[PDB]
Amino acid sequence: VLRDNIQGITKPAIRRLARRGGVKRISGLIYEETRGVLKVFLENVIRDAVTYTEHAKRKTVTAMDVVYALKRQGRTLYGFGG
């Protein structure tokens, strides 16, 4: 039902993310490489979040499921509970 949404991360979106990090000049091959890295990170977090949802026997993913998924990877997140 969903396809090619990875392209939604447009080039300006990758620029602004690199801009906040101090980047001044970017090459063309950075965009394709960035999307590949983004998917791996987002994918690993989703698999862990869904794993908690399945254990809880729910059909909806809550914020806490994402917090626990990030936390165990050394990504303690504040703001959405804890």
Binding site: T76, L77, Y78, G79, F80, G81, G82
Partner: protein, 91 residues
């Protein structure tokens, strides 16, 4: 669930009486209190396990404070923690 929003607000008024807190800024502090709580309670739990002891005293928390907090913050925290227990037992 029980939140520390009532106490995080009082502490600020004792430092900056004329300032407020936003809804999100308060939620961040709640996650901060719980995080630091789990670390100290977690490390203090292992200290009692390593030494083959069951009870968690003020020493297990004092040592856990040094292992977790840097050198500067650890000494100030140990000072406050010592007075709180020294006053409680003495009163």
């Amino acid at each position: 669930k029980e939140s520390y929003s009532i106490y995080v607000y009082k502490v600020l008024k004792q430092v900056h009486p004329d300032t407020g807190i936003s809804s999100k800024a308060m939620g961040i502090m709640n996650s901060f209190v719980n995080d630091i709580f789990e670390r100290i309670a977690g490390e203090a739990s292992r200290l009692a396990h390593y030494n083959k002891r069951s009870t968690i005293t003020s020493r297990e928390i004092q040592t856990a404070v040094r292992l977790l907090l840097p050198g500067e913050l650890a000494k100030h925290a140990v000072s406050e923690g010592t007075k709180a227990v020294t006053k409680y037992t003495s009163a």
